[PDB]
C-alpha cells in the first residue's frame, strides 16, 4: 500500500522520490499531500456573459 511520489528538487547536492504509507482507516488522519491543482482566475477576473478579446474594444 506504499505510495511513491517525486519531490520537486530545490538546491541539488535523476528524479528524487519520497514514500508515504497511511496508517489509519479514517482519511481525516492522513497528512496533507500538497499535490494540488491550479485553476484559472476567469470566474473572478472576467465574469462577463460575452467572452472578451483583449486586443479589441471592451465596449463596442
Amino acid at each position: 500500500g506504499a505510495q511513491v511520489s517525486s519531490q520537486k528538487v530545490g538546491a541539488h547536492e535523476s528524479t528524487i522520490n519520497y514514500t508515504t504509507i497511511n496508517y489509519y482507516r479514517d482519511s481525516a488522519s492522513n497528512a496533507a499531500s500538497k499535490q494540488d491543482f491550479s485553476q484559472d482566475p476567469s470566474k473572478f477576473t472576467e465574469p462577463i456573459k460575452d467572452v472578451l478579446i483583449k486586443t479589441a474594444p471592451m465596449l463596442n
Partner: protein, 268 residues
Amino acid sequence: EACGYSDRVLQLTLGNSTITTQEAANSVVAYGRWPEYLRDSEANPVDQPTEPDVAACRFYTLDTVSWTKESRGWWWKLPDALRDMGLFGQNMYYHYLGRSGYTVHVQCNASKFHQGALGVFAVPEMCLAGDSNTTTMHTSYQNANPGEKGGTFTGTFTPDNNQTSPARRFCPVDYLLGNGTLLGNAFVFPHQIINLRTNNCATLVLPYVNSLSIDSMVKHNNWGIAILPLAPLNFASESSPEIPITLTIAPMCCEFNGLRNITLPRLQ
C-alpha cells in the same frame, strides 16, 4: 457585428416582462455560474418541490431612490427585498424552505453633461455591522430586513447610546463596506460600475449561493446588493443635482419545499 448587434444594446425577457437597454456595459454572471434548479445528487428535503416558474420568475421593480451630491450609498438583501413581490413572496412565506437565483438590473440614466460613477456589488452573505459599542450581533430582525425599501450607508460611525432601549440597528460606514473591510477591495465580489459617460445600467446574474442546497428564506438572506457612489454626482454647475436610480430584480429557477400555513412575520 457587421449586421448591427452590440454589447451595449440588450433585451432581457423573463415571463411577461421585457427590459431593453441601449447603453449597457455587457452583463455579469457571478462566479461564472448561471442559476439552476436543485439536482438530485445534491437534493436534501424529500418532498415534491413547488416551482412557480413564470408566475414568480419575472421582473419586479422596487421603489426608485434618488442619487444626489450627498448620497453615501444604498443596500438591499435577497430574498428580503422581494418578500412582498406578487406570487414570489407568497410562495416564499407558505414554505419552510426555498432557493432562488436572480437577475439584478440597476437603472440610472443621466446626460452627456453629467458625471459620476456608481459601484454595484453583489455580496454573498453580506453581514453588516451594528450600531452598538456595548453589545454585539444585536441588530433586530425588523431592523435587519428593510424589505424593498432597503437601507443606506453612512459616512460616519455613530454609536447608539440609549442603553435602556437600544436602537438595535445596523450602522454601515461606507468606506468599510459596512462590515469592517475596505470598500476599495469590494471588487473581488461580482460587480459592475455604472459610469455615467459610459453606461446607464448594471446587469448581474446571480446564482443561488449558500453552504446548503436549500434553506430558510425567511431566516436567511443569501445575497446583499450594495450600491455606492465611487465618484460623486456632478452636473453642469448646479450645486444640487439629482438623478433617479431604479432597481428591477427577477427571481430565477426558484423552488420551494416544506408546504404549510403562511408565515406571518412580525416585521415592525
